[PDB]
């Protein structure tokens, strides 16, 4: 063939922390189909917003918004237990269907995106350019969001373990841990990666008996 | 400057499932330092092997092995709660120190890797070549390992929730769930991504009351 139809930019969805997670990489021959499983961030969450993005930047806000839709009717569950499978499907005509399917409940919602959506040739180029001009800030951004999500995980996990421990936990351990979890929660409200890791480590430093209880 | 000293290939460590996780990207100017936090895969795990890798392939076995060392003395904890911070540090002389530090226990182990370790110019090139010749198989491999680790997570989580539920769970729910967890565990022993997702969904399909109990 003398030609190939390819995606000029990456396609994906916004995930927790405001980061674009890629489902179809830049430069993919179409027709193409890819799927990944995502989940909930909060206990008892009833819905997820799927926000479809085109572009090469790490910040979702820095990419082109192709549309969003909600999947609701997610049944009560602990965070991270629902299996929300997201599929990007680009048919032979260049049309993108994104769907989100709850593997438990069976619910499905889609958005269809025409082949002529997104950035034009000019902007595809200004976009590829910046992904490079800013490769650094993006990396610092992405690792901040990862730290933040790791801190939020440990925040939630440790609180749950404290409950499940209840009386097994000495009051001197419980006072230290709950003070660390307050400072953690205060830090996660910030954009300071080192300060988030300091409170994470503080918590790991005081939680050792908790961990030994939780393991038994 | 007319020259820059740069890393010709990516550097990292082997993580669960046999996948190389990159800590320093190909083409980085040295001196450079980067760190990431990893954790344990099993409850009560006492040690981690750090296995240092150079190269562009997704399978660790497909990369160049720069060395490995263990960090032990990890205190009893639930899986995924320890914070094992791994640092790659390439000084102005081209020497790589990799360290692993337990943020709770304070233990640290390192390996020092001389500047002349790894693949020579020829092999750097044969390596970059294959990362491309095989970009596909690598992606299929990496998403198999991710599915497998997501399935293992849900396997472990659901068993724990069954325990914490105990009598709250109807025996008709508990029989269905424990049968799904047996088939899941049988599938995770395989290299079939679709079969792993089938048992995951089977489990999500039978676990709904469990999820509603676990959330309360």
């Amino acid at each position: 063939v003398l030609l190939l139809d390819v995606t000029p930019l990456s396609l994906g969805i916004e995930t927790m922390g405001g980061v674009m997670t890629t489902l179809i990489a830049k430069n993919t021959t179409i027709p193409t189909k890819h799927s990944q499983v995502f989940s909930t961030a909060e206990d008892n969450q009833s819905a997820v917003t799927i926000h479809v993005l085109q572009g090469e930047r790490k910040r979702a806000a820095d990419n082109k918004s192709l549309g969003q839709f909600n999947l609701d009717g997610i049944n009560p569950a602990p965070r991270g237990m629902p299996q929300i499978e997201v599929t990007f499907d680009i048919d032979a005509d260049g049309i993108l269907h994104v769907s989100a399917k709850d593997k438990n409940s069976g619910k499905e919602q889609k958005i269809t995106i025409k082949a002529s959506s997104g950035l034009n040739e000019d902007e595809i180029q200004k976009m590829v350019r910046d992904a490079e001009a800013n490769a650094e800030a993006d990396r610092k951004f992405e690792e901040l969001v990862q730290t933040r999500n790791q801190g939020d995980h440990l925040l939630h996990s440790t609180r749950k373990q404290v409950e499940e421990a209840g009386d097994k936990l000495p009051a001197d351990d419980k006072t230290a841990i709950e003070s660390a979890l307050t400072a953690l929660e205060t830090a996660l409200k910030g954009e300071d990666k080192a300060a988030i890791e300091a409170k994470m480590q503080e918590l790991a430093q005081v939680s050792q008996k908790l961990m030994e209880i939780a393991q038994q | 400057v007319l020259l820059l000293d740069v890393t010709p290939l990516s550097l990292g460590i082997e993580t669960m499932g046999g996948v190389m996780t990159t800590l320093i990207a190909k083409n980085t100017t040295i001196p450079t330092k980067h760190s990431q936090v990893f954790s344990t895969a099993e409850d009560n795990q006492s040690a981690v092997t750090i296995h240092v890798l150079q190269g562009e392939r997704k399978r660790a076995a497909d990369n160049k092995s720069l060395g490995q060392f263990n960090l032990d003395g990890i205190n009893p904890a639930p899986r995924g709660m320890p914070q094992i911070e791994v640092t790659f540090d390439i000084d102005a002389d081209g020497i790589l120190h990799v360290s692993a530090k337990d943020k709770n226990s304070g233990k640290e182990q390192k390996i020092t890797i001389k500047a002349s370790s790894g693949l020579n110019e020829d092999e750097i090139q044969k390596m970059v070549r294959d990362a491309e010749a095989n970009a596909e198989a690598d992606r299929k491999f990496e998403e198999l390992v991710q599915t497998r680790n997501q399935g293992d997570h849900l396997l472990h989580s659901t068993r724990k929730q069954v325990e914490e539920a105990g009598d709250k769970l109807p025996a008709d729910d508990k029989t269905a769930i424990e049968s799904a967890l047996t088939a899941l565990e049988t599938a995770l022993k395989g290299e079939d991504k679709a079969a792993i997702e089938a048992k995951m969904q089977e489990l999500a399909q039978v676990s709904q009351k469990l999820m509603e109990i676990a959330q309360q």
Binding site: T15, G18, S39, A41, S46, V48, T49, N149 | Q150
Partner: peptide, 7 residues
């Protein structure tokens, strides 16, 4: 609603 979180 919250954005999906990816494991």
């Amino acid at each position: 609603p919250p954005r999906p979180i990816y494991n």
